[PDB]
Each structure stands twice: as structure tokens, then as C-alpha cells.
Amino acid sequence: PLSETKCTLKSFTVEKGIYQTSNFRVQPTESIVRFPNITNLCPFDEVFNATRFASVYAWNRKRISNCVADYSVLYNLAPFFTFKCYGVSPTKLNDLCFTNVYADSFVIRGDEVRQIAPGQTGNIADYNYKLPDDFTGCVIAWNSNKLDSKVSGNYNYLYRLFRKSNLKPFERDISTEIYQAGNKPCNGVAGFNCYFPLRSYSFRPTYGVGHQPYRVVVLSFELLHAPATVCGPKKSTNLVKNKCVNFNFNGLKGTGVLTESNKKFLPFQQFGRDIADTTDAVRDPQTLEILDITPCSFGGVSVITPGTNTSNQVAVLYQGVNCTEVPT
Amino acid sequence: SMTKTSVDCTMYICGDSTECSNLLLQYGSFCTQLKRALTGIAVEQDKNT
């Protein structure tokens, strides 16, 4: 602590007086990861491996919740053509936890497959499928041209070119209504001032990249709108009380001391916030208990010494911290 | 005299993470100026008494 005076002041010698040096550092011991016990894996193979799919104008939205996810086919193993994520880190998929997911299954040809991104402009990117700027999820594509193609072409899958205005995202168009430019009524069929928006895909194996069909499944993640029951295979440890430790509580991380809450709380409450809007209290995921969070490493270090021409003895002042409980 | 306060940059800016303490050193002596300014207030508040 004589040389802690020389380190903070950036000087070779010591002047006589009292100098503020540093603060306490309390190292955490263990790490606590809490996730509830669910023996059911998530049905990710039902949306990927199914025989018949839907179109780009009307898709099949599969709500998947209250399970344990398997990300090893989407991260370590690569059966699939490309991995495109935007707001989520692909390595951190197994770390973070979300409530539910909405899978959108649609087949887009390889010329038009570059229009799937937030904030694009195109035929699919205006009148069919959009993404918002706050969208959270990933885009997974795979080449289907050895299976779903046909020599004469596959007209069973369909798409719609035309719409009167720009379509809002997360909305399916089920309307069979003929697009009417003028004042002539269509009466269900094409004609003068009546165009038919519904088209069929170009899919053949013999042609190039733009005729190759791709199976695109886009996942939509919902973060902190609800309690989070869905993430990867993370383990679980015991709760440690009266110790400064690292926290992982349902994806939320921190450092503190777990103490018992004496107040009356909501049964649906996941966590709660202080005057600074940080989490001071959180419900346990497996059993119903709410434990408070009291942070560690508080108080300063002040030294009192004579200078280098007098004596090397250093008196150390701990400010604000009781020394009955208790720098290298 | 008035109330003598001292503000640490470790607990206030950082949420006890290792990335925040590593990127604080790229800004350098900005918190060296603030701790010497609050020290020089607290010397002169004892000279007022």
C-alpha cells in the first residue's frame, strides 16, 4: 500500500497526507444456472422434415412452446444450405431463452431468394412478405431441387404478384379477389382492367440457379414479453445462499447474494426492478420462491502514510465497511 | 459548508462485467480527472470550517 500510492498518483515518491487509492474487489465463487425440468424435446423436426408445405402468401404458423430445444442440427452439424441470423448471435442460441416461436414455411426460387431481409424492395418484399426492424430470429434455407422439382414444372405451389398497396408483415393473404385497376367489374374472371395476381413457380432441375427451389424456414423469437420456457440443453445446479456468486436466472445474468424476500409478490411475476431499473428480485424457475439480489464489492480503500524520506509505515482506512465480517 | 460526495467509475459505469473494465481503459484518464476534482472540493470544504 506504500506502492499503491505510487501507482495511482504516477509519481516516484510519496508526499505526506491522505490519498484515496482503490475499491474492494470480491471474486465470485460458483455459478448458478436455473432452468425448469422438462422431459419433452421441441418438435423442430416436424416443421423441417414434413412432406407437404404451404405457399408464400399463406403459410403454416406452428407455435412451439414449453419444451427443451435442440440446436445441434442448426449449429454444429450442417445439413442445410445457409445459416442467416440478424439480431441473435448463432453461437449464443443455446444460451438465451425465449417464450415461444413462430415458424414460417415457404418456398421461394433462387432468383427471388435474396429479398428476404428487413427493409427490402421487391415483388415478394412489398406485396407478399416483409420483416420489421425490431424482428428477432434467424433464416434457415435448404436446397430442395433433388426432391420437389419436376421436368415439366411443378405448378402446385403458388405465389401472388399483385396487391393494391403494401402489405403489413406477419399477415397472410387468403383473398381470391381479382385485382381491379379500372371501373370495369371483373365478375371473378380476368378481362379489361382486371389482372390475375396468382402465378405458379418455374421449378425445373435442368436450368440454373434461379430455377432451383429453396425451402426457407424463418423463426421468430419473442424476448422478455413473458416467462421463457424454451432454450437449449443447459444444466441445473443448487441454489447458494449468503455468498457472492454469478447468476444465470432464465437467461438473465448478474452477480449478488440471494436473500429471502419478506414482501407480498405476484404469482405471475418473473422479476422486478429497483429505482435504477436493474433486477433486485427474481422468482425461482423450478419452485415458487422469490430471492432478493444484494450486490457485492462496495467501499473504498484509503491509505495514510508519511513520505519516503520519513517512514514506510502505512495506515489503511476502510471507509463505510464494517470490519467484523472481514486488494491482494 | 456543504455535502462532500465521492463517485466511483467502477460500480457506476460497469455492471460488474469483464468487457466494461477492458473498454474503460481505452478512454483513459477521464475518470482520473473526476476523482481529483471531487478530492479538491473535499479539501476546501474542510478549510471552510
Partner: peptide, 22 residues
Amino acid sequence: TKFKGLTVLPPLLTDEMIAQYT
């Protein structure tokens, strides 16, 4: 007439000793 690292420095001259000079 807190946990974020905000420390209130105590005064050197206590209010009992201010009245001793008074």
C-alpha cells in the same frame, strides 16, 4: 434534515465540536 458506488464523505469537524468553538 447507494449500491451503485455512491459514497458520502463524512465531515472532519463534528457538530458537537462546532458548538465547542461557538
